[PDB]
Amino acid sequence: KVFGRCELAAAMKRHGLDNYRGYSLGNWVCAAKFESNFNTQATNRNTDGSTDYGILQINSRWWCNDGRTPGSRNLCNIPCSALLSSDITASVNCAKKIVSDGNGMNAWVAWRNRCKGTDVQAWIRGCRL
Ligand SMILES: CN(C)CCN(C)C
Ligand SMILES: CN(C)CCN(C)C
Ligand SMILES: CN(C)CCN(C)C
Ligand SMILES: CN(C)CCN(C)C
Ligand SMILES: [Cl-]
Ligand SMILES: [Cl-]
Ligand SMILES: [Cl-]
Ligand code: NA
User: Are residues 124 and 18 in contact, defined by beta-carbon separation less than 8 angstroms?
Assistant: First the structure.
């Protein structure tokens, strides 16, 4: 599923991301835009052999199981394919664990390089929330 901008802000708000670990909603929408273009089915292979999955491009080196990432962990206790659902629940719940891991949203290099320090509230401007 390719979400609309406001559609995804609404879903993320419902799932409790607005100000989660102090990151306002727009940070999450900005991250999703640059990670996946709001596409829940996005997958991208990493140099190390892990893969990133879903709207927030959550990696199989640490967070999910895809059966093909040797030495990896599954700290979200989910199959990586759960992160590809049209329903963002599993991506959200796993993102909550990730952003609590020590480095906040810096865990998403795209957030750090494309959203951090910018006017992230633009990403929810206009939306009925
Ligand atoms: C994961 N971010 C950094 C890029 C998303 N696609 C192009 C892999
Ligand atoms: C899609 N990602 C990987 C890059 C930026 N988009 C949103 C235009
Ligand atoms: C920062 N700006 C360009 C993103 C919000 N738009 C797409 C409504
Ligand atoms: C839906 N319209 C009436 C706005 C109310 N909330 C969502 C801000
Ligand atoms: Cl915001
Ligand atoms: Cl594996
Ligand atoms: Cl933080
Ligand atoms: Na894994």
Answer: no
